[PDB]
Write a protein that binds this ligand. Structure first.
Ligand SMILES: Nc1nc2c(ncn2[C@@H]2O[C@H](COP(=O)(O)OP(=O)(O)OP(O)(O)=S)[C@@H](O)[C@H]2O)c(=O)[nH]1
Length: 393
């Protein structure tokens, strides 16, 4: 099975009853980046050997997905992107539609036509052609009530390319508009057709990866940082899914129902901060949580102040005085409070226990408005395009 992180290693190593998750994701990747992500999700298995998430990958040609390793060929669906399905500016548009519907219907339904997932997790890299194109397509499909369940979009943001930036800003703007209409029409407590959008910033993940690993001068120079980024992003998502359902606490227990609400009710931008805490002291704890939020894999200058829900849990060792001290609890609370006053929004923070000697703090903020990365990207995009036009001879 896939053991994408030290935490997944420790879990399946000390827990042989990991046979269910909090929410049954139906994973669908689109474009190279998306496919790579979905291929990792397809690699996860329960203690009993069965597969965790049914997944499909999408792209234009068979060639694009030739190197997938966990998604069998049958599930590798092949067919700008918006034109094809557009019942007009592309003949037999319904053809592609019916095919998408059939493939989705055959992979996410049992024998009697019943959906076997709770929510669709669509992964894609913004900035590319098929990627952003699919993202934009997903929005129109949701507006057309295409999906039988809510959809969660996991999106990476580009950099270094003005053309990719512009494509990503167009999508984000379309996402934000969709969210505005959905937020006005649905009650703050109803399940939303667009559950959430989780953004990843390539520039941010690259810096994190290239700063670490290389305490000398040999950065290996051959390791694709993106592969490392994908592992970190996907294992975090998988981990937050299995923890609530497989781990409990003797104090504040976080349940799958809490996770489900957090992921489906807010309906806007959501982020995650995973902080491993081996050093059991207040300053190290605060510092690790803050780094995970402001300089972690899911950081994108989020508008934490606009969050409407939060959640999370510190998976801590049994019989560890540090994580049974009021000063610790107060530090965690006080630390999250610097991002968004918890007393003002729904949500809870649990402290599940696992059979290991270090703790991991998973902090989640949901229902936020446009990540400010939209702004820094629009600025960087303008600069690149300028130095581009400039210098030119
Ligand atoms: N985080 C992450 N980003 C990736 C990965 N592969 C590509 N990217 C980034 O994602 C963006 C789009 O990637 P890609 O998936 O190639 O787009 P696409 O539309 O599917 O490809 P095309 O149609 O332009 S060739 C680019 O900005 C690229 O730098 C990956 O495995 N992880």
């Amino acid at each position: 099975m896939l053991l994408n992180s030290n935490e997944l290693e420790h879990i399946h190593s000390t827990n042989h009853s990991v046979n269910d998750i909090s929410i049954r994701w139906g994973v669908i990747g689109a474009g190279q980046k998306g496919n790579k992500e979905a291929d990792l999700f397809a690699g996860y298995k329960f203690s009993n050997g069965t597969t965790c998430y049914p997944t499909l990958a999408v792209n234009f040609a068979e060639s694009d997905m030739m190197h997938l390793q966990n998604i069998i060929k049958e599930d590798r669906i092949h067919f700008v992107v918006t034109d094809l399905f557009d019942p007009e500016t592309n003949p037999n548009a319904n053809g592609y539609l019916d095919k998408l519907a059939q493939e989705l219907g055959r992979k996410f339904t049992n024998e009697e036509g019943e959906v076997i997932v709770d929510q669709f997790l669509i992964c894609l890299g913004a900035g590319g052609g098929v990627g952003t194109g699919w993202g934009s397509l997903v929005l129109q499909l949701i507006r057309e009530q295409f999906f039988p369940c809510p959809v969660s979009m996991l999106i990476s943001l580009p950099s270094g390319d003005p053309d990719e930036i512009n494509n990503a800003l167009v999508l984000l703007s379309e996402i934000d508009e969709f969210m505005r209409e959905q937020d006005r029409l649905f009650g703050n407590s109803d399940i939303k057709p667009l559950a959430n959008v989780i953004v990843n910033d390539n520039t941010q993940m690259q810096r994190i990866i290239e700063s670490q690993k290389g305490t000398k001068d040999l950065k290996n120079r051959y390791v694709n940082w993106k592969e490392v980024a994908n592992d970190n992003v996907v294992s975090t998502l998988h981990e937050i899914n299995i923890i609530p359902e497989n781990y409990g606490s003797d104090n504040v227990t976080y349940d799958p129902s809490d996770l489900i609400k957090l992921l489906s009710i807010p309906g806007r931008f959501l982020t995650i901060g995973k902080a491993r805490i081996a050093k059991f002291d207040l300053h190290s704890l605060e510092n690790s949580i803050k780094r995970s939020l402001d300089e972690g894999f899911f950081s994108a200058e989020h508008q934490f102040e606009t969050a409407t829900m939060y959640g999370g849990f510190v998976l801590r060792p049994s019989n560890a005085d540090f994580f049974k001290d009021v000063n610790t609890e107060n530090r965690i609370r006080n630390t999250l409070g610097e991002y968004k006053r918890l007393d003002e929004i729904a949500g809870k923070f649990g402290d599940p226990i696992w059979d290991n000697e270090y703790a991991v703090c998973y902090t989640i903020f949901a229902g936020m408005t446009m990540p400010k990365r939209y702004i820094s990207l629009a600025r960087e995009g303008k600069e690149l395009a300028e130095k581009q036009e400039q210098l030119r001879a």
